[PDB]
Design a binder for this molecule. Sequence first.
Ligand code: HEM
Ligand code: ASD
Ligand code: K
Ligand code: MG
Length: 407
Amino acid sequence: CPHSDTLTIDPMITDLAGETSRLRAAGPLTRIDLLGVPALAVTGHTLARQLLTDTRLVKDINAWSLWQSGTVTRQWPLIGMIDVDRSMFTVDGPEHRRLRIKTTQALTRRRLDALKPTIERYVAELLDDLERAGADGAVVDLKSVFAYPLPMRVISALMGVPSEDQEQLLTWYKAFFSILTPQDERLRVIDEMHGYFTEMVRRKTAEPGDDLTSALIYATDGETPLTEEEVIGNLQALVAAGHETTVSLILTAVRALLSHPEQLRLVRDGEIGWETAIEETLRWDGPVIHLLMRFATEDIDLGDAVIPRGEGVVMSYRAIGRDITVHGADADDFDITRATAARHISFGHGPHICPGAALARLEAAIALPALFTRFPHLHPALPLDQIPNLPVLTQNDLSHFPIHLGR
Ligand code: HEM
Ligand SMILES: C[C@]12CCC(=O)C=C1CC[C@@H]1[C@@H]2CC[C@]2(C)C(=O)CC[C@@H]12
Ligand SMILES: [K+]
Ligand SMILES: [Mg+2]
């Protein structure tokens, strides 16, 4: 269809592959349209690396000229992705580290050793649900039975979300992410999520436990305490991210491996590490499509192009993972043996780099082999290429994943 010099991101995710190719080819910096709102998108690996460390690009929505003019408001269906409370997510500079430190420390690989048994238990529980559900050769939704609930259980255990509240959170998130949710109802869901997590912080304040939320509340020894807004802001970021991204990584890793059986075999037979298959999945078909937004505090000259003060900059991570300069001409193929499998930046780069990356990697490294060892003849009951995305513009969110447990 006709040549346009603004690339409209289709909210129905009708053509993710085409849109992702279009972006790579239009880049590495190009003009996009997000439901009527213009922004720049970084689609190049090298330029993203550089801009993710540029101190003239900030998260603070008040640096967005469109926000300042009141051209964008809370009616924008994408607004909840950025206009959120003070947290590691919305801060830049020297104040940023303070908002990250207790979380990074809690999520180092060895601190995570103690969470391992827990993850194991939940993976086993849900494989048991799979077995029950796939009985008598029935078709089973791998997402709803397995991949969807696992990461919620895990992040909930970490942060101290009661078992009985986890369902309602999922109901809220589904509403939150879907473009289809009416905007007034989305804003109501956002207020309701905020109210929940506020009360959770109060509950942990009265009665702290061995959880990260309690550690955010009562920090080291001397330190300058986080404010209520900050504790709540981090909590929300950790849960939302911790759940939504991980569900995708599991589903795409499976889809990838089932659609490339020789590669599944490589890892089953211990010739390639499940971890490496995980990295390649992040590079190729990762959890984040577009990362909303950064803003220029002043004009940013890049050579033959300029990001004007006030402009919105999006990191188009999926397009970045398909960078042919970095990954070679076969960048669009899934190949776990490629030499650049782990050179991606799908968790980001610079100060805002994903703090939960070790946890994400561990959830997958446990879930995937457990899944395939338990159900070695697991296979799709629907062509993998026919698994549609949910209308979720920023996230690689698969709708459902019909399988059979197999022989
Ligand atoms: C499973 C795959 C995951 C991917 C691909 C992913 C990716 C990302 C990306 C791209 C960012 C922001 C990059 C940017 O600022 O431009 C980010 C930030 C974040 N992620 Fe993740 N993430 C994952 C899992 C998790 C998990 C498991 C948690 C928490 C347990 C988590 C918590 C966060 C938080 C709190 C931030 C905000 C950090 C900041 O702005 O300072 N993520 N992640
Ligand atoms: C915007 C958001 C939800 C609403 C909220 O209150 C707090 C956050 C912060 C983390 C965001 C998350 C939505 C999805 C994001 C973009 C990811 O895929 C990784 C980080 C994560
Ligand atoms: K707000
Ligand atoms: Mg043109």
